[PDB]
Amino acid sequence: HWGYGKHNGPEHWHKDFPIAKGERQSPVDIDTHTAKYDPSLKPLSVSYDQATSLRILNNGHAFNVEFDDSQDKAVLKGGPLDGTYRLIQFHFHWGSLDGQGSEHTVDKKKYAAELHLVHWNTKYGDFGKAVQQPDGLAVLGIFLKVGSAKPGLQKVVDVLDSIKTKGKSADFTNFDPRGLLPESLDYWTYPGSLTTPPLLECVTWIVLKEPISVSSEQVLKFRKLNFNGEGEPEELMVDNWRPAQPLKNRQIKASFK
Numbered sequence: 448h449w450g451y452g453k454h455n456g457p458e459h460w461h462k463d464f465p466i467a468k469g470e471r472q473s474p475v476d477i478d479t480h481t482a483k484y485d486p487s488l489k490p491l492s493v494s495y496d497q498a499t500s501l502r503i504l505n506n507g508h509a510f511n512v513e514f515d516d517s518q519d520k521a522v523l524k525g526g527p528l529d530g531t532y533r534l535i536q537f538h539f540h541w542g543s544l545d546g547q548g549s550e551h552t553v554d555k556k557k558y559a560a561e562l563h564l565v566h567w568n569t570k571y572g573d574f575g576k577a578v579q580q581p582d583g584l585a586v587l588g589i590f591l592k593v594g595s596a597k598p599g600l601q602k603v604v605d606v607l608d609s610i611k612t613k614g615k616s617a618d619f620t621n622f623d624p625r626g627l628l629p630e631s632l633d634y635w636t637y638p639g640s641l642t643t644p645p646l647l648e649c650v651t652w653i654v655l656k657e658p659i660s661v662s663s664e665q666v667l668k669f670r671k672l673n674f675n676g677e678g679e680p681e682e683l684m685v686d687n688w689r690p691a692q693p694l695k696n697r698q699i700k701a702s703f704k
């Protein structure tokens with residue numbers, strides 16, 4: 448099945464998921480010189496004070512930190528969005544080396560990693576219904592650069608030994624995702640897709656301009672994870688990023704001058 452090797456990576460996905468060659472695929476390169484400032488965009492409203500993390504899972508593609516999304520406890524609103532979007536999970540994409548790992552790029556620059564906070568539109572009732580709608584999801588994307596440690600990331604890093612291989616989970620309560628945000632909420636936005644199969648064109652992307660800093664040590668721990676299951680040949684979970692896709696007939700809008 449699909450993955451990030453030579454034989455099963457991004458360049459193969461279209462055979463099982465033809466929407467891979469669609470009109471609104473993600474990620475994309477963000478050309479900062481052609482993204483136009485849109486004064487009509489609102490500030491983003493990130494309301495995570497009541498968030499309830501539950502569990503962390505290695506799904507064989509990344510690790511997901513999952514939240515209780517049975518009520519409006521951690522929500523994203525404002526920005527480019529109409530309505531209310533509930534946080535379901537976050538996860539990262541990262542590289543084998545610090546010079547690659549992000550999915551979005553900025554003037555062709557690749558960051559060491561990218562965080563995706565995934566939210567679904569409450570008007571559709573559940574996640575599975577939301578991903579069938581063009582405005583079903585809002586994903587907040589945050590770039591990671593290597594420098595100073597991110598203190599708020601360390602709780603995640605330190606549990607990763609317990610979910611080394613595909614299908615392992617661990618309890619992961621009381622984690623505050625506010626500790627993963629940069630200072631500024633300035634953003635770019637465009638309409639796109641999930642970046643993994645099934646590649647559904649259901650996402651309003653909100654990509655923050657300001658990266659967070661993580662330490663080399665932190666990212667090194669991500670790279671100790673495995674794609675494989677327990678007692679299978681070890682294949683390090685690295686380079687779990689889809690490259691930039693054609694922008695096609697889209698505009699990327701900036702919230703800031």
Ligand SMILES: Cc1cccc([N+](=O)[O-])c1
Pocket residue numbers: 563565586640641642643644645
């Ligand atoms: C399959 C799946 C599920 C949730 C989120 C994403 N995504 O952001 O690519 C993909």
Ligand SMILES: [Zn+2]
Pocket residue numbers: 538539540563642
């Ligand atoms: Zn992602």
